[PDB]
Every structure is written in structure tokens, then in C-alpha cells.
Subunit: 67 residues, 12 copies
């Protein structure tokens, strides 16, 4: 009876992996409703002069569809 | 020339796998047009006192984009 | 000593997943002998006005080779 | 804080896929407690004179560990 | 800080693989903004009397989300 | 009701990827009937003094079985 | 001569990924002996009003079997 | 210009893995011509009272198609 | 009706791959009953001064559950 | 007796997929000797105002090691 | 025109996942030039008396090749 | 603190799988130092008039990086 949708996002952060995930979820909840779960598909990033420049976490976000 | 889009849905049902797929497709067709095919990516579910509580079928739905 | 062969078939049905599998196996046994096991590789289908038009079960069929 | 364990089972049935899953879950709940979810990893089976002899559903069962 | 979204499209063409990709991207840029990268997930197609009828390139398109 | 079979071929060409696919399909249609679709599984090749010697496209070809 | 066993656990934590792993390992060492290594299979989680509710790390734990 | 075909076989042997592969290739060369390469997809087997009863090597065999 | 369980083991040996598998199965049969089949998931090992120090075969062992 | 090494390269081109592969192989042969084969692992690219800006082909290059 | 190379490293740390990545990148930049991006392939580790002994992050590092 | 590197090799032998692995490791230790572990990625080979001509084992070799 219930139907969910999954959207694929890429959260980024200079701080770490959790912050990268949280950035994705923060943006997701502005536009999507009934956010339930997430699944990390991929962890990558960019490299700068001091090592990791940007952590990039490719993420699926699952949420309940209405009506 | 033709371009399609794929959306990832999770259909659920207490009855079985086909009903779970049909629940996803029924909801899809309310909002999406030119639904053509589907691809089952994953079959999971929740467990209750009497065994399977809910069947959950993770599904990609392909449809033609307009214009 | 024994050698088996695997053939990849796609069974279809408007009724459900088991019927799709059975359609593949019914056709397989007309031409192939010593059918032993099957492995479902993929579940997909077509969509019509009333939801699932056709279930399509991609299937490997394993059978013993003679001689 | 919570920790879960996953066990891999193979449920079988001459009837169909749901019944195969249910057979696994029925046996699981005799010995395991706090059964929460399952994930189907694989669908296979044996072939007889009348097509499918036995459906075999390879399944992961997730449950909460105590203390 | 930056968040991207990925959408899955299927571009088609009778001419070849690059044209199939380009058809997807051309349609994508009508509706989506800040298109950055793509990832080919799958190459398939239909067969006609003269060989390949239609090339079909399943593609993920990544773009920056605003705000 | 309808049952398809999939055969795995490797098409080769010194020209490019599309030609390699077309070589596989051209040979397929001499012996197989009711060719419907293809799925590229793998792209590889051999290297010579001037770069790519031979493109090799590993391909599944799907066709309807008769009777 | 030596034989190891692998058990699949899911560690959870509201804090982060390392804490989720550590929760799994802490529970593991209460019951299992000769714990040697782990392999992360999957990172997922639940979503709440403030973003990540629970981080869930699916983990294989390898340990030496006795006698 | 050249087109190859791949057939999937399962070689078995009570001796070991190489013998299992050789059993498959021996049977293959009775019926197939221009055998070129093989790819091991899977290694499994049956268990008896003295350990391994039968080694089973699932194998793809590639060969050149004529004309 | 019948339900099986799968356990994941790592057999090791300085001799070779078969011996590594047999070591796993020998230990398995001391504690587990109704051992039926195995599936090799992974082959790895350690390196010493004379090449392979230890072969390590990651293996799933399937057995029938009682009552 | 023979040992090969595989190196992973990313060839790029504004023209197409073959040219991207050829760019990788051209650079490879300046530094590496006894180049034998390649395997395409991934096809991606960047997007510009006119569609595909750059095709990027992630490629494994296999070559014979000396002495 | 541009060609990149990918090298596979395993960074380790007793502190956490980010530190493990950073250790790999720190060592990489001593010897490699034009480091651009990384891709995490695998997360594993060793277990000690107090849980995680060492986090081990298997990582691909991509960098631009010169001239 | 410690960083490892992984190199991908293909060992070959007319004798068997272990010998193929050993050939790769023998060549590796001439040029690489602090060789620790290996992971078999793939088993393939060539076919001759008497069955297996050459066994080919695709192998990752992991070793500790210095300074
Ligand atoms: C990549 C992709 C996958 C498809 N898979 C299937 C398949 O699952 N089974 C099927 O019957 N048709 C499949 N089709 C064909 C579509 O279902 C549909 O019949 C065809 O694309 C025509 O769509 P249209 O008339 O809306 O343009 C596939 C098409 C594409 C683009
Ligand atoms: C690689 C392979 C996979 C098999 N998978 C199954 C399985 O799915 N379930 C099962 O009951 N038997 C399985 N079997 C055993 C066969 O179903 C069959 O019982 C056995 O090969 C003996 O049959 P035969 O007398 O025709 O040689 C498998 C055998 C092989 C070779
Ligand atoms: C996960 C992900 C994958 C990316 N893959 C590529 C790549 O395929 N090739 C490339 O040139 N850039 C790649 N990029 C970088 C983007 O193409 C883009 O240049 C960058 O995100 C900055 O764009 P922005 O200003 O729109 O944020 C990737 C970025 C992310 C988030
Ligand atoms: C599992 C499978 C995969 C398919 N994939 C595609 C797809 O790649 N693209 C497409 O246009 N049609 C796809 N089709 C649809 C077929 O190409 C074909 O149009 C349809 O099955 C009707 O075939 P028939 O008229 O010979 O019975 C697929 C069909 C099946 C069975
Ligand atoms: C299949 C398998 C995988 C292993 N993976 C790792 C690895 O991830 N990192 C590591 O440091 N050790 C790894 N080990 C080695 C063990 O952690 C341990 O150091 C070694 O087996 C010695 O254990 P023992 O003294 O109990 O016999 C692995 C061992 C096996 C059998
Ligand atoms: C990612 C990775 C995978 C490993 N896998 C194994 C394993 O397959 N089996 C094993 O015995 N050791 C494994 N190890 C541990 C190494 O073989 C080695 O024993 C350990 O890293 C100590 O090496 P060192 O003294 O040079 O620092 C692994 C180590 C790493 C980093
Ligand atoms: Na972290
Ligand atoms: Na069903
Ligand atoms: Na092309
Ligand atoms: Na062997």
C-alpha cells in the first residue's frame, strides 16, 4: 500500500564524511517530505595542497510518497 | 531522438511480491506519464509475529520524457 | 566427470513471477534434456494502462550434457 | 548502541517464492529472537518433470542482538 | 556545503553511442540547470533488419542543486 | 507465454565500438531469427603499434524462441 | 591449518560511523573470541527531523575458530 | 570482422579445480570448434563424509564463430 | 519445507587451494551436521620470502537445518 | 611463467569514446612497453553549454613485464 | 588530450576513517604530482582488545600525467 | 600511520592455479619490497588442442610503502 521514492544526492564537506551526509540531508529536507532512510553508495573527494579538499558522499535518500 | 527517465520506487504489500510491484506502479501512474517498463533491483521486507509483515520491492520505473 | 551447460532464457507472463518462470521451463523441456536447476538473474516487465502488462523473468537453466 | 546480526538462510517450497520466504522465517523464529527484516539475495530452484520442483530463496535475516 | 543531485536518463539514437548520450544531455538541459557530469551505466539497444535499430545509453546526469 | 533466449557474443572491429556491435549482429542474423535487443556487457580490445588494434565488444543478444 | 569464521553484524550509533563500528565490535567481543579483522559492507541510516537519526554500518567480523 | 560466442559450462571433478576445468574443456572440444579462452565465474561443490565430494567450476568458454 | 543455513568460513593452507577448502570443511563437520554444498566467495593469501606463505579461501558452507 | 601488469588510466577527448581510449593508449606507449590489451571500466564525462564537453574513459591497460 | 593515472593505496589510522584517508593522501603527495581526486573502494580494519585497533581505507588516487 | 599500495598483476602458468599465482609473486618480489598479501580477482585462461593451454590468474598484490 505504501510507496516510497529514492533520490540520489551528493553531499560535500571539507570537514568529514558525517558532515557531507548531513549536508545532503539538510538540503533534502527543504524540498522533500517524509524522509526515512539513506544508503551510502560511494565515498570520493577532491585533493588539494593539504590533502583532502572536499569529501563527497554519494547517497540515496528514501522517502514516503503521499496519496 | 527519444529520451527516457528512470525513477526508483519502493512498493510495499502484506500480500506478496506482485502486489508490491503493482502498488508502486499504481502510485507512479498518478503522477508520471508514458510509463513503459520496470526493473526489480531488490526484494526485502519486514518480519512480524506471523512471518513476513511487509514485502518491499525496490523498483526502477522507466518512462518516456515529453517534448 | 559430469559436465553441465547453462542456457539463459527470458520467461514472460501476464499473471506473475512463478508463471513467467514456468513458461521458460515449459519451453526449455521441449528441446533440452536433463534439466536440473535454474537461477533467476533478473526480474523486469512492461507497463500498461492497468499496471503490469507483462512480467519478464530472466533465468539461467542448468542441465546435464550427454556423452 | 544497538547491534544487529544477520544470518543467511535458504527457504524452500514447491508452492512459490513467498511460501519459500515464509518457510525460512518460520524456522528462523523458533530459534532466533527479535527478527526485524530480511533481504533476498538469490532466487533459484530445482526442475522436475512438471517444471519447477522446488523454489529456493536465499535470504538474509536481520535481528537485534540482546544485552 | 554544495549538494548535487543525480538523475537517471536513457538517451537513444539510430546513429551511435555519442549521439545517444548527446540526445539525453540536450533534453536534460531544457529542464535542469547547472549540469556538471555524466556517468554511463549501461549500453543496450534494439535490433532491426539492418542490425542496430536504436542505440540506448542509460546515463546518470549530475547537477548542482541551488539554494 | 512468449519465451526469449539470450546468447553471448563478442563482436570485433578495427574501426570502433558501433562497428564491433554491428559485426556481432550481422553474424547473429545469419543463424538466429527474431533478434530483438542487445545488452553490452563489456568493452575491451587489443593494443598495437598505433594504439587500438582491435575493439572487442562483449554483447548479449536476445531473441524470441519459436513454437 | 587455521580456520576463521565470519559473522555479519550491523552496528548503530547516533554519533557517527566509527562509533557505529565500535558498537558492533564491543557487542561482538562479549560472545566471540579471537576477533581479528572487520570489513565494512554497507553504510546506511535513518533520517529524523535534525538529519541523521541513526548511522548503521553493516560489517563482517572475522575471527579464528578454536580446536 | 571476427565474431566469437561464449557458452557457459559447469565442469566437475572429485580431484580438484584444474581437473574440473579440464573436464569442461574436454567435453566442449567434442562439439565446439575454435575454442580460444575461458573465464571462471564461480567455484562451488558438494560435501560428503570425507569433505569435498565434488568440485564444481562454473566456466565461460569463448570460441570463434565460422563464416 | 526444508530450510538450510549458510555459514561463512575461511580455510587456510600452505599447500594450495583445494587443501584450504578441505581444512574449512574438516573443521565445519566437527560442529555442523548435514553439510551439503559450498561456494567459494574469495581467494586471497599472505606472502612470504618464498612466495605464497598461506592460501586463504573464503567459503560459504550450506547445510540442512533440523526439525 | 609470463607475468603481466595492469595500470589504470583515464583517457579524455572532446571528440568521442574511441578518441578518449586512443589518447590513453598513446600516452601509455611513451612510457610502458609490451602493451597487449585494455579493458574499459567506466565511461563518464563533463557537461558544457553544448552538451558533452569532455568524454572520459576509465581504462585498464595490460602489458607484459620483462625479465 | 589530458590523461590521468589511478593508483590504489591503503591508508591506515588508529583514529578514524578521515585520518586513514589523509594518511594515504599525505604519503601520495610526497611522490606523486597533480593529485586531483580519490575514490574509496573499501573500508576494513583490525580488531584489538579495545575494539578497532586500526582503520584501513582502500583508496584509488587519481592524478594528471605530465607531457 | 602505515600506508600500503596495491598493484594488479596477471600470473600465468601451464601447470595450474597455484603456479600461476607463484609466478606473479616471484616476479613481484624482484622489484617490489615488503610484500604482504594478495587477492585473486579473476581466473581465466587460454585453450589449446589438449584443453587448458595457459592458466591466467589476475591478482592484486599489497605491499607496505616506505618512509
Ligand atoms: C533501456 C531500456 C530498457 C528497456 N527494457 C525493456 C524490457 O524490460 N522489456 C520490454 O518489454 N521492453 C523494454 N524496453 C522497451 C520499452 O518498454 C518500450 O516498449 C520502448 O522503449 C518504446 O517506448 P515508447 O513507445 O514510449 O517510445 C526498454 C527500453 C529501454 C529504453
Ligand atoms: C553449479 C550447480 C548448481 C547447482 N545448484 C543447485 C541448487 O540450486 N539446488 C539444488 O537442489 N541442486 C543444485 N545443483 C545440483 C543439481 O540440481 C543436480 O541435482 C545434480 O547436479 C545431479 O544431477 P545429475 O544426475 O543430472 O547430474 C547444482 C549443481 C551444479 C552443477
Ligand atoms: C561525485 C561527483 C563526481 C564527479 N565526477 C567528475 C568527473 O567525472 N569528471 C570531472 O571532470 N569532474 C567531476 N566532478 C566535478 C564536477 O564536474 C564539477 O566540476 C564540480 O563539482 C564543481 O562544479 P560546481 O561549480 O557546479 O559545483 C564530480 C563531482 C562530484 C560531486
Ligand atoms: C528482458 C528483456 C529486455 C528487453 N530490453 C529492451 C531494451 O533494451 N530496449 C528495448 O527497446 N526493448 C527491450 N525489450 C523489448 C524487446 O526488444 C521486444 O521489443 C519485445 O520483447 C517484443 O518482442 P517480440 O515482438 O519478438 O515478441 C526487452 C525485452 C525483454 C524480454
Ligand atoms: C580472509 C582474511 C582476511 C584478512 N584481512 C585482513 C585485513 O583486512 N587487515 C589485516 O590487518 N589483517 C587481515 N587478516 C589477517 C588477520 O587479521 C590476522 O592478523 C591473521 O589472520 C593472524 O591471526 P591469528 O593470529 O589469529 O591466526 C585477514 C585474514 C583472513 C583469513
Ligand atoms: C587492506 C589490507 C588487506 C589485508 N588483507 C589481509 C589478508 O588477506 N590476510 C592476511 O593475513 N593479512 C592481510 N592484511 C594484513 C597484512 O598482510 C600484514 O600482515 C599487516 O598489514 C602487517 O604488515 P606490516 O608489518 O608490513 O605493517 C591486510 C592488510 C591491509 C591493509
Ligand atoms: Na567518519
Ligand atoms: Na511471487
Ligand atoms: Na563510439
Ligand atoms: Na587448484
Amino acid at each position: 500500500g505504501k510507496v516510497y521514492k529514492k533520490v540520489e544526492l551528493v553531499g560535500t564537506s571539507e570537514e568529514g564524511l558525517e558532515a557531507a551526509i548531513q549536508a545532503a540531508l539538510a538540503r533534502a529536507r527543504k524540498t522533500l517530505r517524509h524522509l526515512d532512510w539513506f544508503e551510502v553508495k560511494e565515498i570520493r573527494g577532491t585533493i588539494g595542497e593539504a590533502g583532502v579538499k572536499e569529501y563527497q558522499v554519494v547517497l540515496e535518500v528514501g522517502f514516503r510518497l503521499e496519496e
